[PDB]
Nucleic acid binder design. Sequence first.
RNA 1: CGAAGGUGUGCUGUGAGGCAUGCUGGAGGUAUCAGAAGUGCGAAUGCUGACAUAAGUAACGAUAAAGCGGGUGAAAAGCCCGCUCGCCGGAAGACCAAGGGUUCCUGUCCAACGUUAAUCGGGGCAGGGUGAGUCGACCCCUAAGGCGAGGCCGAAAGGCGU
RNA 2: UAAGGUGAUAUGAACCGUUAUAACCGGCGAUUUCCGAAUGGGGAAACCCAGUGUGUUUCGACACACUAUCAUUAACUGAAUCCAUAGGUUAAUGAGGCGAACCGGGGGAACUGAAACAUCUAAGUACCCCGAGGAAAAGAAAUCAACCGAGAUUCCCCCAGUAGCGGCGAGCGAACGGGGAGCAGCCCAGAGCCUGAAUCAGUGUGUGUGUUAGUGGAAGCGUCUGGAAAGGCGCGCGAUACAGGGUGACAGCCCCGUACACAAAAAUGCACAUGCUGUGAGCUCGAUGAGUAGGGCGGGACACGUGGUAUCCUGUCUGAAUAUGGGGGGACCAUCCUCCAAGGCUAAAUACUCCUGACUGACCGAUAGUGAACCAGUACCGUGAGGGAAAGGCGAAAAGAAC
Lengths: 62, 46, 102, 93, 77
Amino acid sequence: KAKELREKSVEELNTELLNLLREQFNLRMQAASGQLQQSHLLKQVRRDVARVKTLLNEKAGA
Amino acid sequence: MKRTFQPSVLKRNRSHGFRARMATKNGRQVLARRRAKGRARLTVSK
Amino acid sequence: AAKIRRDDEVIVLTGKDKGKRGKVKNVLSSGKVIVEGINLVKKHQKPVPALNQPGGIVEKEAAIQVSNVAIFNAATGKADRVGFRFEDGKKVRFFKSNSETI
Amino acid sequence: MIREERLLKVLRAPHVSEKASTAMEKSNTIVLKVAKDATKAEIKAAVQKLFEVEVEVVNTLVVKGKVKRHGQRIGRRSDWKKAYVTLKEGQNL
Amino acid sequence: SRVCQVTGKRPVTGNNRSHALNATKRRFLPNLHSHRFWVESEKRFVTLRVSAKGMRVIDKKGIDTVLAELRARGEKY
RNA sequence: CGAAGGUGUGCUGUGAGGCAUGCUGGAGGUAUCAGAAGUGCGAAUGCUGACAUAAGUAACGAUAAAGCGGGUGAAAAGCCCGCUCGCCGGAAGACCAAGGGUUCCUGUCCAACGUUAAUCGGGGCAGGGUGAGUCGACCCCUAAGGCGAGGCCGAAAGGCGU
RNA sequence: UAAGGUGAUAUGAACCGUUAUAACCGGCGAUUUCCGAAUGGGGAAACCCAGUGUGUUUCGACACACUAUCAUUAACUGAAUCCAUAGGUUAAUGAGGCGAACCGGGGGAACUGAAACAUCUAAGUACCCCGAGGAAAAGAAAUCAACCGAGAUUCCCCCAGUAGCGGCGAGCGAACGGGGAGCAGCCCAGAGCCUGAAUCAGUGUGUGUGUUAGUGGAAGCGUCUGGAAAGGCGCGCGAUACAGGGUGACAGCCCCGUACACAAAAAUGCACAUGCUGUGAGCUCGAUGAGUAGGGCGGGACACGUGGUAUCCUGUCUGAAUAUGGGGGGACCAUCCUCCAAGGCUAAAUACUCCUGACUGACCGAUAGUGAACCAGUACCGUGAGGGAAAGGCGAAAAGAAC
Ligand SMILES: [Mg+2]
Ligand SMILES: [Mg+2]
Ligand SMILES: [Mg+2]
Ligand SMILES: [Mg+2]
Ligand SMILES: [Mg+2]
Ligand SMILES: [Mg+2]
Ligand SMILES: [Mg+2]
Ligand SMILES: [Mg+2]
Ligand SMILES: [Mg+2]
Ligand SMILES: [Mg+2]
Ligand SMILES: [Mg+2]
Ligand SMILES: [Mg+2]
Ligand SMILES: [Mg+2]
Ligand SMILES: [Mg+2]
Ligand SMILES: [Mg+2]
Ligand SMILES: [Mg+2]
Ligand SMILES: [Mg+2]
Ligand SMILES: [Mg+2]
Ligand SMILES: [Mg+2]
Ligand SMILES: [Mg+2]
Ligand SMILES: [Mg+2]
Ligand SMILES: [Mg+2]
Ligand SMILES: [Mg+2]
Ligand SMILES: [Mg+2]
Ligand SMILES: [Mg+2]
Ligand SMILES: [Mg+2]
Ligand SMILES: [Mg+2]
Ligand SMILES: [Mg+2]
Ligand SMILES: [Mg+2]
Ligand SMILES: [Mg+2]
Ligand SMILES: [Mg+2]
Ligand SMILES: [Mg+2]
Ligand SMILES: [Mg+2]
Ligand SMILES: [Mg+2]
Ligand SMILES: [Mg+2]
Ligand SMILES: [Mg+2]
Ligand SMILES: [Mg+2]
Ligand SMILES: [Mg+2]
Ligand SMILES: [Mg+2]
Ligand SMILES: [Mg+2]
């Protein structure tokens, strides 16, 4: 990632952000109910949201 | 019998609170001394 | 920069197992290594009810100081020392005794 | 009034207990941990969009985190917001 | 404050010396007076807090010269 | 193949001391001749810590008061259940505020805390629990009084005030 | 830079990575809630409440931006009162607050010493206040000297505890001159002639070099004791490296280093070279700091306490001369010598250490050394300002004691 996300457009990145935030919500619900075996997924999703938001920022005012 | 400490949070904060210290030059000096001493609590707060 | 690495065959220089050889299983940030069949301990492992696990005397490798082992030079059958040099655009390790790359 | 990014961050966890189980069986109310700053309007909208169920009323309270002493030093658990989200007669999830 | 707008004369400190030479801290204040000066060039009176010395400075230099010094200092009148 | 330190012993020095060695200890010590001093303790109602004494003495906190049967438990005068007895009742009941801040409820535990035992507890640990348009706060409004753009005043800091 | 990693107590879980988007180190960016100068208004800090402008496959309410005060500048506006001026609105730019010491300035004690005490001392100290910089301040003679001469300021060593001052008590205490560190000189008080000519600051580029990550870095084996070898013993070897640390006892040759040799994509410091905007060089003819110098009165500063007291500052009252002039040479006068006040700038040698890196100690080693070797400005005490502890060591390795 980061190089693969840079190629996408502002409209495309805004869609992936919404998808990552929906996944983040579903993983939180799964973790809270004690149904998430793969605890490592939360950090991956959280840091992907960060990557998307960083790229959206460098495309908006640069 | 009746002792010297009679609590009131309103009077505590008005008399010794952060804003009361900030209101005068000498009170900002209290905060500065306490900051230089490395005090955890500068004033009694919430 | 590290002279001894995971999977190297090493020879023990110091301690109860001086003279023995073994494969480096893991290299620790403390400057210690776990070497297969070296520095064995027989730990009295306490039972864990959360597994319904019983107790048992377990034989395991205890970490040994990395300075207590030498790279084994199989070609000479002797303990050696590591040096560093650049061969191509990549850094390599070499045996000091015969000047051969590892 | 709402935004999906906000609604997705507002609901934190289902809260499990005897009171929460009885609130579901007897009154069709779900007990949740919501963001501390979440409003009753935000919790209503978030439950309706994400859980696809109709909300009757949202009741909220702030739970104060308990303090534990470790010798001379204290520890403090976090304050959190609890939501009693009553769903309409027709129950799903 | 007890400051002359013209000369900058302000209270100074010193001592009261008795016959027995006992020193007690004192002040020497300037001879200050609030005076309305007619400024022809502005068709207006300008009230200045001035010492009698500063008033003699205005008699010598002229009010326009002295007010120009006040402007250069940033001092409003 | 046992340093310093600790604890004995033998010899030696006028003495402050010194050397040798048994035991303890487990990694450091230092001749000689010089060099520098935080250099020698019994007292200062000295300073800090430890430990005695009195002494298993005084006391165990309202003279409202207990008795028994059953239970739990390793153990029950004290905890739980039961039947009695007694005390307060313009309070020793109930409800607010202030102040405290989880002490609340349930389970579990008893070292320390509880002036005793403690299975019990406001004690330890874990979990649970506080749901508002109309109850309070915030909010609108002002009181004493505070702060106060400009301003007036004051070596500076500041004081007063529209 | 890498074969290992996801900071600690602190395991475990789920995972990431191994030749190059694992991790780790450094340069530059992004994000950076709320409180706090806190700045939209309020407020009992981390909270309460707005105005205006914008967004709404939902254009309710929420989200987002702006809106403090003061100063300078500009535009629009605009009284008493005709013009004007005040006032009013908006915009641009700056400030604000914090923090070691050193530094310049405004104020300024007392205990104490005098064997009492008032002059005097302590002392322009402690403290309060304002302001500033890498230093600050000072500074190119109205300075000294002594008839010979020196040549701004600052700092060091002498002169010298001298000459003096002094209830001539207690105390206070120079300068001239000499030896040194360092050295640098300029501009305005204005016009013309020639014109951007010396310098300085802001800043693009280039090179050198320094910093912020790094890279390589020699040479040992046998035997004895021992749980373990770095120790004893034998024989080798490296050294521009025997600084130091670690490793199961004391290691030049086991490990990290050390001597020596090297390295930057990026940001930055200092030099020169060079581009640009602004500033002005040289020459000739001028000009030469007035409520000032001096004086009376009251104080203060000068080592100098009013003394025979020159010099400096000035709260108050006064008040010149104009280079054929004026100041100083310690009352004052003459003579002579020397300098040119009432405008401004200026590097170095000097002072300091919150902090960063390297190194060092006849400094401490847990009642010592920081208050704090340790989750300490903590626990605890106090309404508050404030006060303020105790507390290090299993072992080589947890092999931390299965049963
Ligand atoms: Mg290296
Ligand atoms: Mg309701
Ligand atoms: Mg509520
Ligand atoms: Mg010793
Ligand atoms: Mg000895
Ligand atoms: Mg000696
Ligand atoms: Mg003693
Ligand atoms: Mg004695
Ligand atoms: Mg007795
Ligand atoms: Mg008795
Ligand atoms: Mg008794
Ligand atoms: Mg017992
Ligand atoms: Mg508790
Ligand atoms: Mg209870
Ligand atoms: Mg007890
Ligand atoms: Mg309890
Ligand atoms: Mg004001
Ligand atoms: Mg006021
Ligand atoms: Mg405010
Ligand atoms: Mg605000
Ligand atoms: Mg308001
Ligand atoms: Mg008009
Ligand atoms: Mg400032
Ligand atoms: Mg005296
Ligand atoms: Mg500065
Ligand atoms: Mg300067
Ligand atoms: Mg001459
Ligand atoms: Mg002196
Ligand atoms: Mg000289
Ligand atoms: Mg010289
Ligand atoms: Mg090496
Ligand atoms: Mg040992
Ligand atoms: Mg002149
Ligand atoms: Mg003069
Ligand atoms: Mg006389
Ligand atoms: Mg003379
Ligand atoms: Mg001059
Ligand atoms: Mg340092
Ligand atoms: Mg200590
Ligand atoms: Mg000790």
